[PDB]
Curated annotation (Swiss-Prot):
Replicates the viral genomic DNA. This polymerase possesses two enzymatic activities: DNA synthesis (polymerase) and an exonucleolytic activity that degrades single-stranded DNA in the 3'- to 5'-direction for proofreading purpose. It catalyses: DNA(n) + a 2'-deoxyribonucleoside 5'-triphosphate = DNA(n+1) + diphosphate. Changing residue 415 to G/F: Increased misinsertion, increased mismatch extension and inefficient proofreading. Residues 103-340 are annotated as: 3'-5'exonuclease. Residues 248-264 are annotated as: Beta hairpin. This is DNA-directed DNA polymerase. PANTHER family: DNA POLYMERASE CATALYTIC SUBUNIT, DNA POLYMERASE DELTA CATALYTIC SUBUNIT. Residues 897-903 are annotated as: Interaction with the polymerase clamp. Its cofactor is Mg(2+). Part of the replicase complex that includes the DNA polymerase, the polymerase clamp, the clamp loader complex, the single-stranded DNA binding protein, and the primase/helicase. Interacts with the polymerase clamp; this interaction constitutes the polymerase holoenzyme.
Length: 906
DNA sequence: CCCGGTATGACAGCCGCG
DNA sequence: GCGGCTGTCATACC
């Protein structure tokens, strides 16, 4: 076993490191690390060190890290570049671990915990920590145990001890339904007072100090609450004891709304799962509370209880504790499915960074470029300050709002990373500039060729073709690595398939499985030794073949995330290799790419269909184009197809046989026109959309930029058994839209695309008739409660007050002086309903906390004074009118067709 | 620097307008 | 009384 690191930190003139040694023991080092930095020198001085520009550099070795840091300030005050890695933690990791890090997760202590705090005051602020911590569930990955800390006596109640017997029983039997998987894994311990509890938790923390600390909201609630609580009761010295190095910093996170404070525990990587999920799930969710996320991933959700949580410990302490245990297990179950922690570790050691820096695409890329440059004796440039200067971004085509019967879409692969390599874009690779014509003229190939010598972007930039760019080289690596690991994953998957044939007829023998590598396909000699092998050994080979497939999967997605990271880094002023001209070179070339191929697809389809001057490309967004296939179908005639699958086959082949070669030679023309280093503009066919054959459906429609619906039969080569609706930007996709209305609008769209006008009309009529019979929760809008106090003037709405906020202030006057009634909290989501003019409430609308019924001492009047008309018009009819206008359909039978004209009268 | 550019929509408030 | 704006706020997605 080769040693790896756990956490690294700099305190004064010392690196403090937690690390696993060659024997597997967790250990700590204090090293008085001697960093190196670099300055420019004359050609006379003989060094092996050069910068990315090739200019010679002399190596300066400092006695400590403070001298290094003071030297950087002195070089700034002189006006000369101070070259090298200024984040000395990264240099230490590079020096101490100059090899491919192979870690062993079972020796990494990964803790996830959750806290409970009874509070009749409202949400207990972590910075003040006014109320007693009355429960802690702390899971440890090494022990595989849930350590549960339980407070029996607090100012808010004296309670019985928790029962594991009851907690395991069925929910109908009065039990908490804690899974038998974790029942034999709970270490329960009750306490007579909070001080005893908090002090035991601290001693527990010292013996089992987390390397990775996770959980839901741990960074913004749990950790701050435990720290501040211990601090307020025992003093700051005791609270620092939560850090292995007894050093803590109070960070102030100032978001563009308010300001909150997080606590930095030196020697611990905090990877909050709420942040970890938002970063790596790539699924946009309405709510990000553990409850919603659990039921989404695990189909079980968080544990239910009766009454307000502020009254739970009193009324049902048995539930309260079991709710705390399950809260921790919910996160562990999610991580068992998604494995974002293992992912985070994988990338942390690949980049050689602090694990919590996986949230930073800047840190990660800074280190990956640093390490590969280090092994070539090359010196990284100094990070220079840059003014935040907004530059052009992605091109988006304004579509003509219409229906579109048949649609076929195509995507460029890894567009921005592809341009970087194609054009060879890097700081040191800038070769000069050319007099730039309008983009229009480069799209139409009317402008003169920018350079015979250098590779070019349509923004005026020129780059060397002979040199290998530092950025281009570094991302080509990542590409090649991903292919390599996805070449091992496909091999490990296919190698397991041959094993599954042997799982039907084996023969027992006392032998261990053969030493073979699953990353590469088996030879004939290994294939000969399959039937003879035993049943015990065959299941061991299947275990290790699948184990190899899991290792390949993790690697191939980690590199995928890096590919998509780079542009972000490159376009960020804080990044070392950032250059504004290089950034606009990427986006502008991309703008040219999509519009040039729009031209080429139009010119090809016109020539083939015989027509001239017809817009086939109906829409385009960044790296994708959408083609109208009507003419292609009408060229064969849709009456010649026997079924839906017949014309989907037709279009699929057409794209591959006719369209894709026309695109490739189209882009090959563009590469030669810009004189680029290599052609890397590749376009895959994604979606084939259209209405079912012999149906009155319209297939798809656009209402504007980023607002469309499509009936998709085939995506990226896989044929769907049943048609699947792709909806983007429309109200069905917005969490502000009421539950029943989100459902109704989707069906309205389904009926439009699959069935036609009359069906939509029959549905609308019925939904209008039955709207008043729907539940008041399902038909209410949801909104975010930001800036409540700002627009509040003595309990009434002020100038420029938003609609939902007005609703909140109406609710507040209705429950003014009522503690049992739910309070609307700044930040949290709210239900909104309109009220008929003349109601006993203040205004025209009421808003109450989301996910809850209204207080019974106000419910009747709300339900009585609801404005259904306004609600149906605002949330349902208006957005539908939106879709139907573009689609050129009617939702109501006799609508005057003169309504679609912007008449005079002016 | 632990994601903001390119987007649309709901609503408030203003301006002309016999 | 209502388009035609501008401004604030809310929420999509790569």
């Amino acid at each position: 076993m080769k040693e790896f690191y756990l956490t690294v930190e700099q305190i004064g003139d010392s690196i403090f490191e937690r690390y696993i040694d060659s024997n597997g023991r967790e250990r700590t080092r204090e090293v008085e690390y001697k960093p190196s930095l670099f300055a420019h020198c004359p050609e006379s001085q003989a060094t092996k060190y050069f910068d990315i520009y090739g200019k010679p550099c002399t190596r300066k070795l400092f006695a400590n890290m403070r001298d290094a840091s003071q030297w950087i300030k002195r070089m700034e005050d002189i006006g000369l570049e101070a070259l090298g890695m200024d984040d000395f933690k990264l240099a230490y990791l590079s020096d101490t671990y100059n090899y491919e890090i192979k870690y062993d997760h079972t020796k990494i202590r990964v803790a996830n915990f959750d806290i409970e705090v009874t509070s009749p005051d409202g949400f207990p602020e972590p910075s003040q920590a006014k109320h007693p911590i009355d429960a802690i569930t702390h899971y440890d990955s090494i022990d595989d145990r849930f350590y549960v800390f339980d407070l029996l006596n607090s100012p808010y109640g004296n309670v019985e001890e928790w029962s594991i017997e009851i907690a395991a029983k069925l929910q109908e039997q009065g039990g908490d339904e804690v899974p038998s998987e974790i029942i034999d894994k709970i270490i329960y311990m009750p306490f007579d007072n909070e001080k005893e509890l908090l002090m035991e938790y601290l001693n527990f923390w010292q013996q089992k100090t987390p390397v990775i600390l996770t959980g839901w909201n741990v960074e913004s609630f749990a950790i701050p609450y435990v720290y501040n609580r211990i601090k307020n009761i025992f003093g700051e010295s005791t609270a620092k004891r939560l850090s292995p190095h007894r050093k803590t910093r109070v960070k102030v996170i100032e978001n563009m709304y308010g300001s909150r404070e997080i606590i930095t525990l030196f020697g611990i990587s905090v990877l909050d799962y709420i942040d970890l999920y938002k970063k790596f799930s790539f699924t946009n969710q309405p709510s990000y509370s553990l409850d919603y996320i659990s039921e989404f991933e695990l189909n079980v959700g968080k544990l239910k209880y009766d009454g307000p949580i502020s009254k739970l410990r009193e009324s049902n302490h048995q539930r309260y504790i079991s709710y705390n245990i399950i809260a921790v297990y919910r996160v562990l179950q999610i991580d068992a499915k998604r494995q974002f922690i293992n992912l985070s570790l994988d990338m942390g050691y690949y980049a050689k960074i602090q694990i919590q820096s996986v949230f930073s695409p800047i840190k990660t890329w800074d280190a990956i470029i640093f390490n590969s440059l280090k092994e070539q004796n090359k010196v990284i440039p100094q990070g220079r300050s840059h003014p935040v200067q907004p530059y052009p971004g992605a091109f988006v085509k304004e579509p003509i709002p219409n229906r579109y019967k048949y649609v076929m879409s195509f995507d460029l692969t890894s567009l921005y990373p592809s341009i970087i390599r194609q054009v060879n874009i890097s700081p040191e690779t800038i070769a000069g500039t050319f007099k730039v014509a309008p983009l229009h003229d480069y799209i139409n190939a009317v402008a003169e060729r920018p350079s015979d010598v250098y590779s070019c972007s349509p923004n005026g930039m020129m780059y060397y073709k002979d040199r290998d760019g530092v950025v281009p080289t570094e991302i080509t690596k990542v590409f090649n690595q991903r292919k390599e690991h996805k070449g091992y994953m496909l091999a490990a998957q296919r190698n397991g398939e041959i094993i599954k044939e042997a799982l039907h007829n084996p023969n027992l023998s006392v032998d261990e499985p053969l030493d073979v590598d699953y990353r590469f396909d088996f030879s004939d000699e290994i294939k000969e030794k399959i039937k003879k092998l035993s049943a015990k050994s065959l299941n061991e080979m299947l275990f290790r073949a699948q184990r190899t497939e899991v290792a390949g999967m993790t690697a191939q997605i980690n590199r995928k995330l890096l590919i998509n990271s780079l542009y972000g880094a490159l376009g960020n002023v804080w990044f070392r290799y950032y250059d504004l001209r290089n950034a606009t070179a990427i986006t502008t070339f991309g703008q040219m790419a999509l519009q040039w191929i729009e031209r080429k697809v139009n010119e090809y389809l016109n020539e083939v269909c015989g027509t001239e001057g017809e817009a086939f490309v109906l829409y385009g967004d960044t790296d994708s184009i959408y083609v109208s296939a009507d003419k292609i179908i009408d060229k064969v005639g849709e009456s010649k197809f026997r079924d839906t699958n017949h014309w989907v086959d037709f279009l699929d082949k057409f794209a591959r046989e006719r369209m894709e070669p026309a695109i490739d030679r189209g882009f090959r023309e563009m590469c030669e026109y810009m004189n680029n280093k290599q052609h890397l503009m590749f376009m895959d066919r994604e979606a084939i959309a259209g209405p079912p054959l012999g149906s009155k459906g319209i297939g798809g429609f656009w209402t504007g930029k980023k607002r469309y619906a499509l009936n998709v039969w085939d995506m990226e080569g896989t044929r769907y058994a049943e048609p699947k609706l792709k909806i983007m930007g429309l109200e069905t996709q917005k969490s502000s839209t009421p539950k029943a209305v989100q459902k109704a609008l989707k069906e309205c769209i389904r009926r439009m695309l699959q069935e036609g006008e009359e069906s939509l009309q029959e549905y609308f009529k019925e939904f209008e008739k039955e709207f008043r019979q729907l539940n008041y929760i399902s038909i209410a809008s949801v909104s975010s409660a930001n800036n409540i106090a700002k627009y509040d003037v003595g309990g009434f709405p002020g100038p420029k007050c938003p609609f939902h906020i007005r609703g909140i202030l109406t609710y507040n006057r209705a429950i003014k002086g009522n503690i049992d009634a739910p309070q609307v909290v700044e930040g949290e989501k709210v239900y909104v309903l309109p009220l008929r003019e003349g109601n006993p409430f203040g205004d025209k609308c009421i808003a109450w906390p989301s996910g809850t019924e209204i207080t019974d001492l106000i419910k009747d009047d709300v339900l009585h004074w609801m404005d259904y008309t306004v609600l149906l018009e605002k949330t349902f009819i208006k957005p539908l009118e939106g879709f139907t206008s573009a689609a050129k359909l009617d939702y109501e039978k006799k609508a005057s067709l003169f309504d679609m004209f912007d008449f005079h009268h002016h």
